Amino acid sequence: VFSEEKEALVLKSWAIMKKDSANLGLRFFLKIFEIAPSARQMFPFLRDSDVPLETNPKLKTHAVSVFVMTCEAAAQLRKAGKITVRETTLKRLGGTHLKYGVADGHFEVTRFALLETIKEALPADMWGPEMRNAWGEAYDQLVAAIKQEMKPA
Amino acid sequence: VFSEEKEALVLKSWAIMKKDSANLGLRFFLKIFEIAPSARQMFPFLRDSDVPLETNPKLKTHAVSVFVMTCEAAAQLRKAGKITVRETTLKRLGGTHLKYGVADGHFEVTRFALLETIKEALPADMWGPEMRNAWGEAYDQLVAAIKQEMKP
Numbered sequence: 248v249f250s251e252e253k254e255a256l257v258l259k260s261w262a263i264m265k266k267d268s269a270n271l272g273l274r275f276f277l278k279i280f281e282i283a284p285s286a287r288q289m290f291p292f293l294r295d296s297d298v299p300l301e302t303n304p305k306l307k308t309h310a311v312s313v314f315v316m317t318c319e320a321a322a323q324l325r326k327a328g329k330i331t332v333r334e335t336t337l338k339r340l341g342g343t344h345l346k347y348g349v350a351d352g353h354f355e356v357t358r359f360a361l362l363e364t365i366k367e368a369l370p371a372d373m374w375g376p377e378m379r380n381a382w383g384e385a386y387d388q389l390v391a392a393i394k395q396e397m398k399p400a
Numbered sequence: 401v402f403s404e405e406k407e408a409l410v411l412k413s414w415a416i417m418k419k420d421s422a423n424l425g426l427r428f429f430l431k432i433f434e435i436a437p438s439a440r441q442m443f444p445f446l447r448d449s450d451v452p453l454e455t456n457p458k459l460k461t462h463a464v465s466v467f468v469m470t471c472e473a474a475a476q477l478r479k480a481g482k483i484t485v486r487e488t489t490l491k492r493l494g495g496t497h498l499k500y501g502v503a504d505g506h507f508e509v510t511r512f513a514l515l516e517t518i519k520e521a522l523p524a525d526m527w528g529p530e531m532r533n534a535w536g537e538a539y540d541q542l543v544a545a546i547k548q549e550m551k552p
């Protein structure tokens with residue numbers, strides 16, 4: 248499923264990050280774009296501006312939205328017994344990502360940027376291999392739920 | 401061109417790293433595969449092995465070779481006035497990376513993996529935005545030189 252031990256690691260870390268989600272959501276996306284600058288081109292609101300990424304107001308709104316959706320899905324994973332998303336559905340997410348040509352490589356880059364952002368966000372006391380694994384696995388479940396809706400039938 | 405200052409930054413860092421190029425070259429490749437595990441499937445000696453990535457004998461040899469080739473290209477960039485690649489040719493590298501299907505996204509990931517590896521190889525004191533930019537720009541010149549030979 249998603250173990251009680253992993254739920255606890257997710258819950259205590261999200262307890263901290265949820266209070267700085269504006270900043271962390273943006274740092275998450277900046278880190279994606281540092282690793283893969285080509286990814287910038289996929290987002291119309293980036294394609295249509297030249298302001299520093301750090302300054303782009305539509306990026307901030309979008310970034311926090313996605314980061315919050317991701318962390319909320321991880322935080323409810325055990326309680327709900329499945330991936331849940333608020334404000335949208337897995338079918339809509341799958342259709343959108345398919346249309347925008349999001350590939351396995353994009354998901355792998357984003358997984359790493361998320362885990363590097365969470366590592367930078369958390370007290371050194373609570374960072375470790377268990378924490379990294381709990382978040383990576385919750386992310387993996389989320390992506391697999393999206394990919395179901397990007398493949399036939 | 402490539403400035404005297406950028407050369408100096410590359411030279412004093414490579415002076416440290418060259419003493420540890422085996423370990424560093426593998427660190428560099430493990431970081432590539434950490435970020436993008438699908439890149440593993442590009443390397444036939446990875447696709448066909450039983451053993452963990454970290455222990456693979458062929459990976460170690462390949463990793464040191466690319467790491468050294470990259471750092472020497474950067475170390476020689478100003479002196480030579482252009483990108484050189486040791487024991488080979490830009491035409492051969494281009495042909496090879498074209499044949500194995502290496503794409504712009506692979507070069508982006510690998511750039512980031514190189515810069516993190518180098519950061520972690522250097523005292524926090526030798527690091528900073530100009531050091532990062534010197535290496536990033538040398539890497540960018542190396543990649544542009546290779547890509548020239550992957551296109552008509």
Ligand code: HEM
Nearest residue numbers: 286289290291313316317335343347349353354357389390
């Ligand atoms: C678990 C991972 C992901 C989640 C939960 C997620 C979620 C979302 C959501 C909620 C939207 C719609 C936003 C809106 O209402 O406008 C969206 C749009 C989009 N996503 Fe993702 N996404 C994920 C991964 C990715 C990845 C890896 C990429 C590529 C690096 C990506 C590229 C896009 C693009 C190009 C759009 C269209 C942008 C737009 O709405 O104008 N997404 N994503």
Ligand code: HEM
Nearest residue numbers: 439442443444445466469470496500502506507510542543
């Ligand atoms: C600065 C960038 C790079 C340099 C200097 C470089 C250099 C090399 C060299 C020297 C070889 C050996 C060719 C031979 O033995 O004939 C090689 C092979 C190869 N490279 Fe790269 N490479 C670079 C980037 C990449 C990237 C970004 C990828 C993909 C993530 C990649 C994938 C491959 C593959 C699949 C091979 C063939 C594997 C094999 O030799 O069996 N390389 N590279």
Ligand SMILES: [C-]#N
Nearest residue numbers: 290309310313
């Ligand atoms: C997806 N943003």
Ligand SMILES: [C-]#N
Nearest residue numbers: 429462463466
């Ligand atoms: C090329 N490795």
